[PDB]
Each structure stands twice: as C-alpha cells, then as structure tokens.
Design a protein around this ligand. Structure first.
Ligand SMILES: [K+]
Ligand SMILES: [K+]
Ligand SMILES: [K+]
Ligand SMILES: [Mg+2]
Ligand SMILES: [Mg+2]
Ligand SMILES: [Mg+2]
Ligand SMILES: [Mg+2]
Ligand SMILES: [Mg+2]
Ligand SMILES: [Mg+2]
Ligand SMILES: [Mg+2]
Ligand SMILES: [Mg+2]
Ligand SMILES: [Mg+2]
Ligand SMILES: [Mg+2]
Ligand SMILES: [Mg+2]
Ligand SMILES: [Mg+2]
Ligand SMILES: [Mg+2]
Ligand SMILES: [Mg+2]
Ligand SMILES: [Mg+2]
Ligand SMILES: [Mg+2]
Ligand SMILES: [Mg+2]
Ligand SMILES: [Mg+2]
Ligand SMILES: [Mg+2]
Ligand SMILES: [Mg+2]
Ligand SMILES: [Mg+2]
Ligand SMILES: [Mg+2]
Ligand SMILES: [Mg+2]
Ligand SMILES: [Mg+2]
Ligand SMILES: [Mg+2]
Ligand SMILES: [Mg+2]
Ligand SMILES: [Mg+2]
Ligand SMILES: [Mg+2]
Ligand SMILES: [Mg+2]
Ligand SMILES: [Mg+2]
Ligand SMILES: [Mg+2]
Ligand SMILES: [Mg+2]
Ligand code: NA
Ligand code: NA
Ligand code: NA
Ligand code: NA
Ligand SMILES: [Zn+2]
Lengths: 123, 80, 53, 53, 122, 50
RNA sequence: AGACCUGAGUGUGGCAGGACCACCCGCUAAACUUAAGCAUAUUACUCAGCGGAGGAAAAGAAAACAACCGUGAUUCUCUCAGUCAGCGGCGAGCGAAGAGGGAUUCAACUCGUUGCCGAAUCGGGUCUUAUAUGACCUCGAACUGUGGCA
RNA sequence: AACCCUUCAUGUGAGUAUUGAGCCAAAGAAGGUGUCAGCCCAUUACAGCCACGGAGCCUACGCGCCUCCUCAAGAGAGUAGCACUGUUUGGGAAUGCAGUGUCAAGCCGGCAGGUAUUUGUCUGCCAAGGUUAAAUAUAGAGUAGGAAGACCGAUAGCGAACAAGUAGCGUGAGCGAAAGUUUGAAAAGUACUUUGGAAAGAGAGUGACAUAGAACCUGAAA
RNA sequence: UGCAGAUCUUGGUUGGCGUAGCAAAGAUCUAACGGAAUAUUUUUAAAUGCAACGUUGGAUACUGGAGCGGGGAAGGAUUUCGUGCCAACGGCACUCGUACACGAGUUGUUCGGUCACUGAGCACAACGUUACACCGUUUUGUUAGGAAAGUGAAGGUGCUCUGAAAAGGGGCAACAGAGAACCUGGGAUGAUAUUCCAAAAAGAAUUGCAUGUGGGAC
RNA sequence: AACGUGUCGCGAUGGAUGACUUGGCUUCCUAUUUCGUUGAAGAACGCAGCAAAGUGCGAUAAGUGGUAUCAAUUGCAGAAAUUGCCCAAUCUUUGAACGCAAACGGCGCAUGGGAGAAGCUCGAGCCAUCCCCGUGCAUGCCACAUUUCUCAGUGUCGAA
C-alpha cells in the first residue's frame, strides 16, 4: 500500500530500507503457506509483491535520470553508454542525417538562386 | 536372422538433442546437426521442402522483440 | 492451387491385393495407407479445379 | 544455482545461528534441498518454533 | 459500430467484445418519469439500480440490481430467484433489454454522463 | 543408469511435473471445454528417450 | 643521427557477420515429356543449387530510330503479330522490332579531361546559445593534386 | 388424446406472430434480445465537439530576429576491333556474351544504317566513368486496418471451425491425424424414500417437452 | 447438378461362431483368518448358492552357484516407499499389481566425473582453391612466404631499471588406458548411505590451503 | 414338435440427413508500413491462492508505469479495481554468439564491489585462505595517435 505518489519524495537510502523491509513479510508469508494458514493471509502475498515492484520501478528511474544528467555534457557524447542512447532501428541509425542528405555544392547554390521556381497561371 | 533377432543387436544411439534447435538430430560422432546444420553459422533451408520451411520460419515462435518494434514503427517512435 | 495435393503419396503397385490408387506414407496416425490424390478419395483433389481466368 | 558457502552465510543472516555442516541434493523435480546442522550452542527446535512450525 | 454488411464480421465483434464494450451493450430504457426529468432515452445498467421486468416469466416484478454478470450478458435482481433440489435459492439471470430502469444510483460521474447525454437546445 | 547430464535431468523433471490430471474446479468454469488431459504419458506406452 | 619508402605492435572511435526471401538483381543449371522410334530440336535460357537488396527493384538522358512533309531519356498498356518478318532432321515446332492511340512527365544533373588559379580543401581543437558550408590555431593528411571559376 | 362404449383425472413455454390504432425518417443498415423488430438495446451524421501530440512531412519554397553565403584547346586503351573455340538469340557468310592469341584511329576521325569483299558518297549519333522521382510487380512474404462474394458448408472448405503442425510414427532427412462440448430460454444438471458392497434398479421431483439426463438437437439404412 | 459394381475411397455392420483355439520351461495340498463375494429355499442333514481370490502356520516339490541368487555399464526415467482402492488393463482369475489415486524418498574434503594426461583421430586460426566455402592442408616433431614468445638468469636502485636464454598458433577426443588423500560398527530408514552419527562425536585416520604461538636459523 | 421363413407394433445397434456456423477460399483498397552486435529469428527453463495443456509474462515474471473510460472479477476463495491504447521501465539460460570449451548448468586474465564465525588493534574497526556479483577481453576491415605512441629492413639517401 505504498502508492507511487508517496515514493516520489523519498531518497535512495529510505527506499532501500523500505525494500529490505518488504522482503521480510514475503518470506514469512511463504513459510506460513506451508502451514496451510487461512486464505485471508494468502491475499497479502499479491499485495506485497506489487509493493516490491513499485519500489524497484522508482529506484531504476532515479538512477537513469542521474546518468543522463551526468553525460549531458558535450565532448562526452562518445563516452555515453549505448543503453542510454536513442534506439530507433539498425537501418535508421546508419542512414544519412538531415544535415548531410541535403548538402549542395557552390555551383548548385548559385544556380538555384539564379533560376527559382515560379507561379504563373494562364489566360 | 536379419529380422526379429537382429533387432536386439541395436545398442547405442546415433543422435542426441541439439543445443541450437532442440531436435533429436545432433550426430554424436560427426558433431553436427542433421536438422539445422549447427555449428555452421547458417541453418538448413531448401526449396524442395516448402512444408519444412513453413515449420521453422518467423511467426511459429514467440516474436518477443519483433512485436515491440512493430508497435514502435506504427506509432512513429513517439516519446517523451 | 495446392488443395488436396500436399502429401507425399505413392501407389503400392500390384501384388499387394489392394487397388492401385496412390496411398499416404508413414505410420501411426490412422491416415497412413489411406487413398490420396484422387477425385474419388476422401481428402483428395477435386476434379477440374476452378480457375480465376 | 546456489552453492553451500552462500547457503551457510544466508542462514546466518536470516536467523542468527551458527552451522557446522551443510549438505545439499537436487530433487527429481528440479528443486534443491539443503540439510543444515546447527552448533550445540543453538537449539534447532527453538529456532523452528520461532519461525513457526 | 458493430453492425455492418458482413454478418460474419458483425457477430464476431459482438461475441468477442471486451468488458468496457460490454457495458455499453447491456443498456436499459428509462421509465417515463425519468425520461421527463432527464431527457435521456436510455442508460447502461449498473449495480444498486432498481429495475422492473417487462418481458418473460417474471413480468411485472421489481427489485434491486445485485450483479452485472458481463461474462454471461445478464444481470441478477433480488427476489428474482429459483429453488434448487436441496432447498438452496439461486439467482436467475435476465437480459438487460427486457427490463426498464425506475431509480438511478447517482454519483459525480453518473451525473456527468447524464448531462452529456441530455438532448436540449442552447 | 547412474549417469546423466544436469540438462537432461531437468528435462525429465519437467515431463514428470506435467503428468498430472486436470483440477476439478476447472471443469466448472463458464464455457469450459476440457474434460480430461489428452497428453497423459505412461513409461511403458510411449518413450521420451532423451 | 636524421629523413623518406615499405611493413608491424598497441590504444581510441566505428562497421561486417544471422534472419526474412511472395515480388526483384547476378550466376549455375536438368530430366520426365513431344517429335506416334530417336541422336540435332522441344520441355527451357524452366525446376532444383549458390550469392545480394528494397518498399519496390532493375532501366534511364542516344556511339537511338528511321529514309519521312521526318521523330527525340527510361518504364508500362492496346496494337504491330501467332506475322504471305524470320529460325527449324525447313519436321515436330519456335518467334521479335520501328511506327500509331495512351498512362506518367515544371525531369534532368555530374566526375575525369582542356583553359585560368594553386591548399583557397579535409581531419582535430577552441569560440560564437552552434561536433555552423562562420572565425582562429594545428613541424596532422594533402602538391604522386583537395577545392574554385569557365 | 389409439379394438369399441361409459366414467373420473391430466395437457398447451417465451408475443419479434394476428387484429385495431398511432409515431419517426437528411436515420428503412443487414448485429443482439426466450418465434419473423424502423419506434426494447446497440447502431445509422457531420450536409460536428473534446483531450494528447517528442521527432517527421505539408502550408506566398508558412512567419519574425541574429549570423553566413549568394545575386585557343580537349572530351575515358590490353579499350574497341580481328582470329580460333564455346554458348545464346527470330537474327539468317555469324544477335549478345566468355576464354586465349593479336591489338587501333584521332593533318582526309570513330560507331550504326539486318547478304560476304574492295572502293566512293549520303544520313544519324560520339562508347570504353557516376547519380536520378512518376506511371510497373508482389505467381505459397510481413505490420496495422477496411470493402466484399451468383464460392464451401464439418468425409466439404486450408492438413488444422476444437489445448493442430498438436497427439502419434521414423536412427535421421522427414511424415502427420481423428475430433462441431449443437442439453435446455434458464442448471432449474434429479433433494428425499426404498433394494443393492458398488455400479445401478424402483419411486419421487425440476422443466411446456426427460423417448431434451450430460460429449444429452434431429436420429436414416445395414 | 442425378450411381450398383472401377481387386474404387472413408466410416459402420456382418455369416463363419460361442467355432479354431488359450497344450515348451514337472505341481500342488490342508486348516485358520480376510473379503459383498455365504452355510443365500416357504412354494432335518445329501439329492435346490456352484466356482474362484490374498495372508499366516504346516506338508510336498522345483531352481541346483555357467541359479526364477547378489551387484554394475548401454538403454529406460519414478517402474522405488507408505496408505487407499477395483471402473478400464495384466488374452482365465484377483481381495493381488511394474494398474489407478494421494502423499513421500536420492545427504560426500577422500566414491565416479571435473579441476589436470596423452591414443586411433577431429578440424578453429593461417594460407590456397572455388562463379559461390557448405572445399583442401592441419603428428614422419607438429600451422602459416612464416615478424603468432608479453615469459624473465645473473646485475643496479629502493625496502624498483637493464636485459641472458627459450624454433615450430589455439583447442577437443578414454565414466574399462595413465591419475586418484577413508576404514570398520550402528537400535541411523517405510524407502539413502565407505554420503547419516556431535562431546565419551561409536569412533580411529589420511591429505589442500591460510594463519598465530613455542623453538632452530636470515 | 423343435429349428427355420415372412408380415405388423415396440425396443436395441449406428451416427446419416436437415436446420444451424466466432472457420476456410477468392478478389479489391488505404498507410508518418519492413528485423539484428543498443544482441534478432529460433530453441530451453520458469512465473497465478487453489493452475495439467493453451494464453500472457521474465526473479519488477497471467505483470510495474502513463493515459482515456468509470465499478467490477467470477468456479470457489479473496478484496471493498477492471477494460482499451501507449510514451517510462524490467527483461532468466542460449542462439550470428564473439574470453576458452561443452551429452560439463565447466575453466580463465584485468578491474571494481560484497559477505566473512580464524588472526590482529582498541563491543566495534582491519580482515588472510575459501566463496559471491558487475564490467571489459573473438576475427577481419576503415579512420586517428591531434600532448602527434613504440618499433623493423646488407630498401633509397645522408651529416658528426
Ligand atoms: K544400467
Ligand atoms: K428485448
Ligand atoms: K581486348
Ligand atoms: Mg538388410
Ligand atoms: Mg554390431
Ligand atoms: Mg557411429
Ligand atoms: Mg566422440
Ligand atoms: Mg506437391
Ligand atoms: Mg479437400
Ligand atoms: Mg552431492
Ligand atoms: Mg538416456
Ligand atoms: Mg546476409
Ligand atoms: Mg527485408
Ligand atoms: Mg509434364
Ligand atoms: Mg518420343
Ligand atoms: Mg523411348
Ligand atoms: Mg529456383
Ligand atoms: Mg534504382
Ligand atoms: Mg525458345
Ligand atoms: Mg568519348
Ligand atoms: Mg543506376
Ligand atoms: Mg476437414
Ligand atoms: Mg438425441
Ligand atoms: Mg450410394
Ligand atoms: Mg473349443
Ligand atoms: Mg497350440
Ligand atoms: Mg531338473
Ligand atoms: Mg533338484
Ligand atoms: Mg483377464
Ligand atoms: Mg502410476
Ligand atoms: Mg594424434
Ligand atoms: Mg581408469
Ligand atoms: Mg575420486
Ligand atoms: Mg534399496
Ligand atoms: Mg562462447
Ligand atoms: Na508414344
Ligand atoms: Na483433414
Ligand atoms: Na543368475
Ligand atoms: Na581431454
Ligand atoms: Zn539443430
């Protein structure tokens, strides 16, 4: 019953203690499962696992935004781990970019300036 | 004695399970698979058996990553 | 264009006390040894299949 | 996938006991079973009742 | 739009509808008094509503809605039940298009739905 | 005999766990079509080999 | 002792490898069958085999047609035409092209070479909100020629 | 209401059916609901209204500001050509190509002009380097969706309307089925009595119908 | 788009027929108990409930150590054990079962493998060939027209430089070859044991690393 | 006599026929429509309260996060979310598979962490041997050494 909104404000140390705490009842619930306790306790198993999953989601998000900020500096773009880069496709990564595909020579630039397209209409 | 009696003389086994395709077609002595040609880099694919090709082609399994990337293409890689 | 002919069937020939229709290979399926490929056989190819032209 | 050394350390952390022997086997169903003998300074029955048996 | 010229397609979409689609499909007409008060012809049925049966074996009966069994395309109404062999009473399902709504359970979301469905000028 | 690789042992373990009957509460579900397990195996009838 | 030439080791940043393969591009390449037999021929420059891409591929801007009162890159369609063109134990059989009516079409550009210049070019670093077709530096590459004009 | 007569008890499911009155239509559209439904439900529209929208594409080459930029010679060489051999073509004294040998011209040039050679005119083009949308294919491909059909209707149609490339077969390459869970509107799926070890039988009960009793519609022939 | 036959296809049914048979490996008997399987009659005891099943005791007899004895490899993979249970299956029978159902069981410093050897042999790298590697070479001391060693003897510095010598790339292939430090007892099980036993370890040992102290030397 | 034969009523055996159809086949159209070393396609093993197959998912395991809709799920539990779509994430062992191998859940080198019950220092700190985890390490080819790295040649020259 941790709820995602509550876990936003917490720091890393508090999250780890909460995560370590939650694993204990999960173990205690499992040993009770072998002692065929009533189904009321068996409902708590699903709640605990969902609570654990939410904590791990928050921890992973916080770590990722830290690394992006650290590597946001220029001249470190070659040192950024590949898992933090954009993953579109194999083909799109190797394709010509916008600043390369539309390159023109000096002669092409002058000719385009000399003979632009027109709108004329007739009669 | 080429019939029933000789059936009792068959002892070992020619093939075991393949590490790449999972079939019982890995030749123990020659160390290669009769079904997928492992450890060769390419696998077997012949046009005289279209039935065999359709048994192994894409879509007969899980497509664990292909499903995700197809969804991204349909949404033109929307992101935050 | 492939309906009813996707089997590796073959005639048993004469001398086995059966008709000379092609029969299905293999064993252990209750389909093995059954007739195939004929317009008179169950699961066979129809006579003069319809075309789109 | 665990080995004896990690099993011994984990038991000490979880239940605060000292062991003198760890024996393991892999069951026919694929699960691993461990026999853990405690020191004479610790009571196995007392630990079992604490866990709830 | 389930209905189309392809009968095979229309029937497949109806019988494979997801849960939120099924909620719209099982709707019931409002009574004359509710119609004059809300200017709404029909509403989907929800739990704790009060309905009156207009067609079938239980014609004229009234009761409160105790379940919306979307998996079976029926609703369960209290006092509409049958006796088993051993003496246990069990509910009997009724299709939502055979009843009419008498009293509505209202919350903030339901009132918003009624307002957006109202057929009035300006 | 005594010898077997651990990978082969795990394959036999999965087949053993699969050789089970259908639970009774499954048959009472809405729209159920399963009556009994059609993949039951006996060691004297069909051989897995492995 | 030091250059140039040729050749190694390591480090930093990148790429290739497999799958799919209906359609498309390059190679390799039969026989059953028909000829009432059969060897040239036919099936067929097809099936099987190997290699390689795309959303289409390939082709494409005249060392082209024609012989007229002349047309004007490529591709496709009707037709030319089962042809009083042609190939063929001249047997069985096989077999196109120009022209004409259309679909599409603001469709065309460029390197080397010749003449005038001769690092004005490329890579790396720094700055300008900028890995600028910008500026400055660079015993780095490049005169065994990168770029600019006709 | 079953050899005939008399007497006493039992038996008709659900109104989308019939009749009489109306109403809507810029909507009559074909799905659902216990029998055949424009008006029980969902649908049927813009002759529309909201949310989210990082990149990309389109719009007086959308629109401001700062920077930058701009406005006498020659023409592809182990190439083309030729000889031999092989293959290919409708290409026929040789259409294209490949191997080896030989190997150019450009102060009266070269290639083509469908019968071989030598010589002279005329006509059209200028090989041996490169890029390029549209109109075309998808003859056992994929990702999302739509339109359908004088097609098949469970031995048919894909092998597969179902836990089907599954069960099963073969050392292996490979081969490969059967099978509509179609009871009923609704499980209301037969409590209880009695015989029996049980399985079941004889009663009773639910349901309009149980000769609709559970792989249960209809239920033919041998 | 019309069926009587194609040694036609797929299902179902059928006389033969309660027939042919169920005849190698010698063989069972008796009392008590168990079981629904009895000692079952209304219309004296025999002539009206037959036949057959498991366990225990006793009898008889077989295998006859090249065994219907006790352990392993290949192959099989829960057939192992306890409890329950008889619809279908074990071509007769079952109360029995390797059947069905529900639960249990496999414990290693020293056993086998591996860490860690070579053999008949295989074929990554390198090179060459092929229109195309999915081809060839690769132990007669041994890859490759072939620069494949990344190790470090004496010596200097201090408490870390300089360099002698070493030809021939990297792997796999033996659960009967090479190699390998543990033995008995148990009242320790329903089922595992040279694997379990805890202070009088029932005990007695052997070996791999790290340490700290007592002692000999730097 | 019996067996046997025939007809009618009823009952068995069997699964045809008819009516049904969330399936197949064929043709046409529209797109911000075309995988992978940033580890694909395939293959294996696991995950639910009761869960064999199938479906979904990966130790965050019939799901975490966002958004729209607005009260269920349903066999029994159990609680007082579910469904559609999608940006943020997780993603076991393998496989082109690439540190070396492989009927082995085996064996390394470098680097950074973790646990530690002997020992040491004053109940804590430092922890030897042993053990666990993350990352890098195939081959080939291109560019660079931007503080211009280290070399080899009876190749061509060349000073003290
Ligand atoms: K054995
Ligand atoms: K209705
Ligand atoms: K030449
Ligand atoms: Mg033979
Ligand atoms: Mg032999
Ligand atoms: Mg062999
Ligand atoms: Mg071998
Ligand atoms: Mg065929
Ligand atoms: Mg067919
Ligand atoms: Mg062990
Ligand atoms: Mg085996
Ligand atoms: Mg490829
Ligand atoms: Mg592709
Ligand atoms: Mg033919
Ligand atoms: Mg002939
Ligand atoms: Mg002949
Ligand atoms: Mg081909
Ligand atoms: Mg192109
Ligand atoms: Mg021809
Ligand atoms: Mg020229
Ligand atoms: Mg081109
Ligand atoms: Mg079929
Ligand atoms: Mg019936
Ligand atoms: Mg007939
Ligand atoms: Mg007899
Ligand atoms: Mg006999
Ligand atoms: Mg004897
Ligand atoms: Mg004797
Ligand atoms: Mg028997
Ligand atoms: Mg069993
Ligand atoms: Mg050798
Ligand atoms: Mg040995
Ligand atoms: Mg040993
Ligand atoms: Mg034993
Ligand atoms: Mg590897
Ligand atoms: Na002939
Ligand atoms: Na079939
Ligand atoms: Na013996
Ligand atoms: Na070895
Ligand atoms: Zn394989």
């Amino acid at each position: 019953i941790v709820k995602i909104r509550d876990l936003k404000e917490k720091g890393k140390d508090d999250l780890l203690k909460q995560l370590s705490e939650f694993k204990k009842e999960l173990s205690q619930l499992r040993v009770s499962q072998q002692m065929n306790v009533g189904a009321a306790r068996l409902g708590r198993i699903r709640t605990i696992r969902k609570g654990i999953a939410r904590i791990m989601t928050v921890l992973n998000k916080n770590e990722r935004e830290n690394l992006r900020k650290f590597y946001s500096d220029k001249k470190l773009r070659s040192a950024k781990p590949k898992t933090l880069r954009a993953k579109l496709t194999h083909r799109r990564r190797l394709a010509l970019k916008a600043n390369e595909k539309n390159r023109k020579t000096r002669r092409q630039l002058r000719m385009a300036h000399k003979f632009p397209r027109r709108i004329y209409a007739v009669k | 004695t080429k019939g029933t009696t000789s059936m009792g003389q068959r002892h070992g086994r020619t093939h075991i399970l393949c590490r790449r395709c999972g079939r019982n077609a890995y030749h123990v002595q020659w160390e290669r698979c009769a079904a997928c040609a492992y450890p060769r880099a390419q696998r077997r694919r012949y046009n005289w058996s279209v039935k065999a090709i359709k048994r192994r082609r894409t879509g007969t399994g899980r497509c664990r990553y292909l499903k995700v990337v197809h969804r991204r293409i349909r949404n033109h890689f929307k992101t935050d | 264009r492939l309906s009813g002919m996707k089997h590796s069937a073959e005639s048993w020939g004469t001398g086995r006390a059966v008709a000379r229709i092609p029969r299905i290979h293999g064993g252990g399926t209750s389909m093995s040894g059954a007739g195939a490929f004929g317009n008179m056989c169950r699961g066979g190819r129809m006579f003069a299949p319809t075309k789109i032209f | 996938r665990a080995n004896k050394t990690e099993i011994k350390k984990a038991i000490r952390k979880l239940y605060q006991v000292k062991t003198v022997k760890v024996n393991t086997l892999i069951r026919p169903d694929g699960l691993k079973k461990a026999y853990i003998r405690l020191s004479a300074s610790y009571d196995a029955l007392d630990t079992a009742n604490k866990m709830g048996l | 739009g389930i209905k189309c010229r392809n009968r095979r397609k229309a029937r497949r979409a109806h019988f494979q509808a997801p849960s939120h689609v099924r909620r719209i499909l099982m709707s019931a007409p409002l009574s004359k008094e509710l119609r004059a008060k809300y200017n709404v012809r029909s509403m989907p049925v929800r739990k704790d509503d009060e309905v009156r049966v207009k067609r079938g074996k239980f014609k004229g009966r009234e009761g409160r809605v105790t379940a919306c069994y979307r998996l079976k395309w029926v609703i369960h109404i209290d006092k509409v039940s049958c006796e088993k062999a051993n003496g246990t009473t069990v509910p009997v399902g009724v299709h939502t298009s055979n009843v009419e709504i008498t009293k509505l359970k209202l919350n903030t979301r339901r009132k918003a739905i009624l307002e957006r469905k109202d057929r009035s000028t300006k | 005999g005594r010898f077997k690789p651990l990978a082969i042992k795990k394959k036999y373990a999965k087949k053993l766990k699969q050789n089970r009957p259908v639970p009774y509460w499954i048959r009472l579900r809405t729209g159920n079509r399963i009556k009994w397990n059609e993949k039951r195996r006996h060691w004297r009838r069909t051989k897995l080999h492995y």
